[PDB]
Amino acid sequence: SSHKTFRIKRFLAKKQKQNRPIPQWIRMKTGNKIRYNSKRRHWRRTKLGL
């Protein structure tokens, strides 16, 4: 809602910054074996526990 506590908004804040695609230059690192952010989240598909 519009009415939030500070600690909820700080929780929502972190979840926003870590829902970002991996940098493109990561693919070039030696022994990368990573391809995409597999922990990406969409607001409509899966909901936060909070």
């Binding site: 600690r7 929780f11 526990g49 909070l50």
Partner: protein
């Protein structure tokens, strides 16, 4: 109707995030965490669930102090001494 219609009127949280153990098991009305038991001092832990014990035991987290304690034991917990500067 006990099915689809009844699921529409659920908009009141029963649990919130716990200050200790950070899990969303802090019952609002009871003011007690259902995961770590936090109105209380002693951490809630039962032997009838070994998976829950191993989900949150020692070593499942950062181990900030104890990981250096394991280091200092190998040298006898020495203090106030220096490596003899060049």
């Amino acid at each position: 109707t006990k099915g689809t219609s009844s699921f529409g009127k659920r908009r009141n949280k029963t649990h919130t995030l716990c200050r200790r153990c950070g899990s969303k098991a802090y019952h609002l009305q009871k003011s007690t965490c259902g995961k770590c038991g936090y109105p209380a001092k002693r951490k809630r832990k039962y032997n009838w669930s070994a998976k829950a014990k191993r989900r949150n035991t020692t070593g499942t987290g950062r181990m900030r102090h104890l990981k250096i304690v394991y280091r200092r034991f190998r040298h006898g917990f020495r203090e106030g001494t220096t490596p003899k500067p060049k």
